[PDB]
Design a binder for these strands. Structure first.
Lengths: 239, 94
RNA sequence: GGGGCGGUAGCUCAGCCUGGGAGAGCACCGGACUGAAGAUCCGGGUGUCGGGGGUUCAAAUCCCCCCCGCCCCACCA
RNA sequence: GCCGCCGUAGCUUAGCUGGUGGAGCGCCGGACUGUUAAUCCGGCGGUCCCCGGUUCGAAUCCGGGCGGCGGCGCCA
RNA sequence: GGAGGGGGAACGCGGGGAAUUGAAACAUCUUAGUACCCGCAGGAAAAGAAAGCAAAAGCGAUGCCGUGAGUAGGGGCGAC
RNA sequence: GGGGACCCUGAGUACCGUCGGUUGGAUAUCCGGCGGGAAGCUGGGAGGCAUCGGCUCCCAACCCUAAAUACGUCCCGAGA
RNA sequence: GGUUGCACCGUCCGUCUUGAAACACGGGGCAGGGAGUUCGCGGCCGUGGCGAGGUUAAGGGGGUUAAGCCCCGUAGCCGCAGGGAAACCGACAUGCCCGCAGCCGGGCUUAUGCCCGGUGAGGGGCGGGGUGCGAAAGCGCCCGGAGUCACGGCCGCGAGA
RNA sequence: CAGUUCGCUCCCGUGACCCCGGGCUAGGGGUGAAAGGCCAAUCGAGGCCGGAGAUAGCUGGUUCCCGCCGAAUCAUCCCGCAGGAUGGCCUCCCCGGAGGUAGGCGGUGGGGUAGAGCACUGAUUGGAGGUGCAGGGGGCGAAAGCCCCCGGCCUCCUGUCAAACUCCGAACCCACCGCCGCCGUAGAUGGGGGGAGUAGGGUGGCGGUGUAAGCCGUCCACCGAGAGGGGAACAACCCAG
RNA sequence: CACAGGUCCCAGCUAGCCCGAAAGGGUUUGUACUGGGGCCGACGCCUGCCCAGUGCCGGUAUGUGAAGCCCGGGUACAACCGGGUGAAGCACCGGUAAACGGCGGGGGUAACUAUAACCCUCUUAAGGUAGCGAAAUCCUUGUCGGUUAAAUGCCGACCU
RNA sequence: CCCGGUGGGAAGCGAAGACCCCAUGGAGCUUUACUGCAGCCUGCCGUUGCCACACGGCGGGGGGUGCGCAGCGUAGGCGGGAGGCGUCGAAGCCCGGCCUCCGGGUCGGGUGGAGCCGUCCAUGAGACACCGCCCACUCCCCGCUGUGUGGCUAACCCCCGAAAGGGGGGACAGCGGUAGGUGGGCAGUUUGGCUGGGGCGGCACGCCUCCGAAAAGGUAUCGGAGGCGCCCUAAGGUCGGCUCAGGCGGGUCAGGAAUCCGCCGUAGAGUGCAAGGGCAAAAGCCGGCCUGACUGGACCCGUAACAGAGGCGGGUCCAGCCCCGAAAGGGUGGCCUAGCGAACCCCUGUGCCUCCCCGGUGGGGGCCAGGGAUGACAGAAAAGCUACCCUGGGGAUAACAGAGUCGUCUCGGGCGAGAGCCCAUAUCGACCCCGAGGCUUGCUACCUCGCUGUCGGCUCUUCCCAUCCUGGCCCUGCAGCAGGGGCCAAGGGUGGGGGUGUUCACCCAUUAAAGGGGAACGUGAGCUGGGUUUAGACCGUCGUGAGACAGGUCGGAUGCUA
């Protein structure tokens, strides 16, 4: 039977399906070796750049212990804004403090999930997490999906929103302009359909336009057969 | 068909006539116990060979007759050729 | 073949473990009720309650042998 | 030309182990109604398509026939 | 201060391990521990002084050759 | 040489249970893996199922081993 | 003997095929090369030694330049008794009758040869026997000494065959 | 010219464009604006080497001569009918040993095909005479009425003919015996052992199917594998071995 | 074919999906305006109806469901036999068609001849809706019309 | 002989034909084919620790609780047992705790202060006389052990840090091992044979009958008719008695039935079931008895003639044990012919051998027989697509063309019912019958599958007449002019356009007339290449899907120096 599929290639880390890492810009680090408690730490926005692979703008920050690292840029930032990191950071936009120290009902981004791992949550253009409720036990934060995850209160986060909103408000326009974007990122394209792909190429669909077996697939289905609507609970838009 | 529960017929053992009693054979289970259990070894990963055995039959529009004929007096049974084909075998009461 | 469940009054079943002459609603016949019709009440009965045999004075369900359907397995030299 | 399957009250349809026969519809006679419709009681006709056969008896199970329904009529 | 690696005509020892084919199909079986692959040693290797053998009698390390014997035994109990 | 406890006498081993690989190895091959797990010679294993008794043999879990047996690089001798 | 004229007859070759001169397939021509082979095992055959036994293999002595042959080794295989799955049991170096060859007798043809009576190895047919199944009976298989080894070849199977 | 070329014409020609060099991804893998395309004159799974002298019931070929005999192309079984095995048949060697019986006559048996027909099983054609009766039409119908009437159900002399009918039944085939013939003691007849070969054709007869040619049986001279002579030639007609 | 646009689906990152014998790895210097997978294929107007069957999903008292362990029996031990305990899985319930797909037959009836707006019947979940249609419709060169002197064409129309 | 030209032939060269079939060939692809294998889910064991809680199962004691129905009354069961109880302190009053069927019993406080019970009998079974052990639900301290939930942190894992150390989570998870489930993601394979080539379809693939079947025997086809894959323990066995369908006459009835009496009546009945064969003092019918459809072991035949051949069946003996019948004698199943099943495996049943020094026990092996399947029936374990194909071959076999044939097709002849105004035959002509051709279709498989290139068109040329015109003629329902019908005749002529890929055919306008057919369905080593039947694609239908279609449709190369 047929060849490995379009997704199975991806997993190899072969180069058509390898992100560039040499035209791409820094990652967020908050650094916990100078700790949150017994803070020492303010910095100055050294410059602001666009990061290609995040599809969002990012800030270089010059810290006052002498380390240079990027922090994902908030809206309404100036070059020469001071950003502080600690709990004794002011409670204002672009300032970074623990969740407990942040009020309830304020918008927040760049939230830690393990204390001191530098931001692994809410680091996309224009989207933001809401602090709905806070208790000394656990602080519950409401995620971009509408969905509530419980985090440790001693996670760090930055007050405000991410910059680079309206991102999908503007369209991509044409196949050319789009081609241009995908080179900037990594996303296998032009991507055709399995339906007129031969029986070898793809599990569903033959020579001509019509599906083989149902599109909807198991949650225990094999690798290389898990294409379509993956483990769909519902489909359509009707009763 | 309907067959008498008891019927007078030849006993090999007594070598003399007596009234015999009719029953009906019955399937034992397997499982220790056999060349076929000894066959359970064979089936390592991959196929058995034999231990893969049929894929389905079946089951012949009739049945054959399957009986035991027991001497009343000694109590010991003797078997006869079956192949006397019968749909159904019913024993009556006396 | 193994295990389990259901086969009951014309119908659908209820009463396993929770035992008796024993059941309920609906069809069906009769009587109330309204100007009318219907629905809704009140009577009537149709199975010792799947066969055959056993323990019990009395057993649907208990016991020994079962027909049939049903579901899960095992199995066909 | 092949291979399945029908015909059942005037119509349309249930049904059959061979001992049977209905429903809805039309129609007919009464009855509400002023008349009528609707509604409401009372009914009936069926060789259960033709024609053989087996049986004690076939609407039913086999033979054949007739009209109506699907499926092949082709890689050659 | 002393060593290692790599090579070597075949052989040797230890690991990984098919299929065409045969069974006139073929899956168990067969090819076969073969082909092919890895590690490694020598001039021979390995085995080697019984927790053996089992004609129950009789023997006292181990290779190898003849033979046992195409025997016992395995196996769609078929082919082998 | 005989006199008392005879010297203690090898562990994840022996053995058991579960899955393979392999073999001719059959219940009775060997080797691994997974789980369990002895004995102090006042003992243990072996004799082709298990267990109990007699009977006969022999000491695993430490180590080495010449020679006789493979080859054809090389030399010589040989040719239905 | 070469060549050619004349008379008469003749549609290659090989293969496929029921039928090929073929409008079936193959071949320019010539030269060379080119296909039933080896081992094991079984079943046959001919031939040779030995003899109820027969043959060594492996081996080392010996001899030789080497080596074969010589003589020595007898392990093992098959045969000499069979039947039965096994337990386990265990048979005719002959009792009876035909008769081929030959021998013996008579008759007959010139002879070879022939017709008829005994005797008849070899052979043929009974009986009695062993064992297995079997209460028994009745069959199955076997029974009054010939094989082993050697050499060539035919043929089967496994092997590229 | 070229194992993918040439000219005219034609599309694109600031772009999702073209191009160079470096560098990445390798065979059930990659890569694919996805054609089963492409991955070095090789792609619906590259090439090289090995397994490997794979195996094929399948095509081709298989080589000195002479002498003697000389086929079957059928049957049963078979995941078998383009093949095997085992018989018939062909051929070779050995054994025992007195008969063997292709031909013809008679005797004693077997038989339902040709033909023929009403004798059955029993299909069917046609009209008289019985008026023996089960019923669809009419009548005096005073009403299944007394009485006749017309499809008709079945006797009779008659009337058509009948794979799977038969009162019958040839020619003819076949069993056994006797006889004669023939054949054998230069060993037949029978027994054992070794070696094969299992596509048929074809006229005629008798068919079965089929408008037919053809198919498929059967016996058949013959061809296969057999010349020569004749039919103009002409596989199988005639003559001839 | 891509394509911009549209939609369905999955995942809280110690994820989902995918590669790898293994260690480990791609996405990822990535974090839901992400990034992964399908379907459809610019715009304009729209996208009916069905969960019966297939598929997916969530759940499951009950039945059922292995090895293990347990208990009973057996065996001086063991094989073994029987029952409970029996997870996912199955039966079972619900959702779900911009998931795969489906989207029917006869009869009778109107001033008059026509048809049937109309009315019966039944399968099997539902019964073809907006549209468009003799088509990139068999019969067939339908028929009518345009167009040609003359057109098995084309086009427009009807449309069963 | 040579040159030049064009290519008609050399079935010219380039091909071991892609079409088709066959082969127990191969490959790719598909799936709810067969069987395996990754991944995923999931239980268990190890990794694997501490507190509690709740909770399942033992295991020891214990502790309330028992309306069959009579009824003194709520009899739970047998058995010892009609007497036990009472200063070894009783009724009977007053409450307290109590479960519960609130049926009513149990029970601690106390007043008391000396009796209470059944034998008796009812009750299907008798004692709240007492004594034992139980079987009910049920509840609980303690001893063991599972399971579920939460807390903890010391293993282990994810983050940070060169390190030191800390953060998140925690016996979860992860990893090792194993079990079950899902699982074309992956891999190996198969998917039969018969056959007017092949496929659907059918199966004539096992077996039975008559016929075909040629008067012995054999004997084929997708050869005619038409069955069996069970039924029966009497539908067997034996014995005695007995004779039938149907028709007639008398009887009853509307008729008729069952029933009745007599007479005829060689087989039309019956004998399970096809067919055929057998049979009348029976094998049929009826009745009784009985169970041989028994055990063992043969011969022979069939199977499979002759003639090797397994399984299976049968006749026919003899021994043993019964049965029946008076006996003779019969019975090896059903009067005969269909009702058929292997090696191996397992289970059954009996008796007997055997299991590695030896005995005993368990559990084995084996001899024998019966039963359980292979209906594709002398037995593999088994789905599809391929126009992406590939190979070995075959004209043993399809498409194309030819040959053969000639149902069809074309044409022609005879007879002449009947109509045409009377008038068969000017003309028209049914029923039926007979020929010729080879021009349509079909049949065939002879030739060809190591390729004789398809159609149509174009271009170029020959031939045939059964003649469309032309010429020469006959008849007429021939007035003319114009027809209808027939004869001779191929010398010549027989066109141009519109649609269609079109040979054919449809239409237009002309024309004297605008005839038909053959030449590899003339003509591709001449052109053209639109169509048919490649590989791209779409729609409809079908199909789970791959994928298919003589359905519709766009596109899709035309080699060679004689």
């Amino acid at each position: 039977m047929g060849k490995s599929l379009i997704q199975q290639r991806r997993g190899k880390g072969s180069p058509t399906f390898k992100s560039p890492s040499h035209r791409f810009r820094g990652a967020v680090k908050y650094i916990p070796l100078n700790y949150t408690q017994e803070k020492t730490l303010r910095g100055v926005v050294e410059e602001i750049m666009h990061d290609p692979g995040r599809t969002a703008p990012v800030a270089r920050v010059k810290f006052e212990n002498g380390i240079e690292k990027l922090i994902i840029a908030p809206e309404g930032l100036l070059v020469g804004q001071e950003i502080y990191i600690g709990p004794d950071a002011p409670i204002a936009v672009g300032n970074t403090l623990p969740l407990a120290k942040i009020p309830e009902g304020t918008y927040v981004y760049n939230i830690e999930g393990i204390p001191g791992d530098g931001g692994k949550y809410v680091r996309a253009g224009g989207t933001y997490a809401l602090v709905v409720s806070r208790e000394p036990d656990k602080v519950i934060v409401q995620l971009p999906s509408g969905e509530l995850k419980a985090f440790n209160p001693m996670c760090r986060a930055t007050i405000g929103v991410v910059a680079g909103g309206g991102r999908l408000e503007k369209p991509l326009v044409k196949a050319g302009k789009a081609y241009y974007k995908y080179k900037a990122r990594n996303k296998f394209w032009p991507t055709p359909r399995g339906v007129k792909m031969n029986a070898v190429n793809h599990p569903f669909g033959g020579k001509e336009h019509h599906p083989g077996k149902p599109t909807t697939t198991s949650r225990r289905a094999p690798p290389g057969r898990k294409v379509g609507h993956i483990a769909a609970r519902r489909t359509g838009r009707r009763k | 068909m309907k067959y008498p529960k008891q019927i007078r017929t030849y006993c090999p053992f007594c070598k003399k006539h007596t009234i015999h009693k009719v029953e009906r054979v019955k399937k034992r289970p397997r499982s220790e116990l056999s060349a076929g259990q000894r066959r359970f070894r064979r089936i390592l990963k991959g196929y058995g060979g034999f231990p893969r055995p049929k894929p389905e039959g079946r089951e012949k529009p009739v049945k054959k007759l399957d009986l035991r004929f027991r001497c009343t007096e000694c109590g010991k049974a003797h078997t006869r050729g079956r192949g006397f084909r019968v749909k159904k075998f019913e024993l009556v009461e006396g």
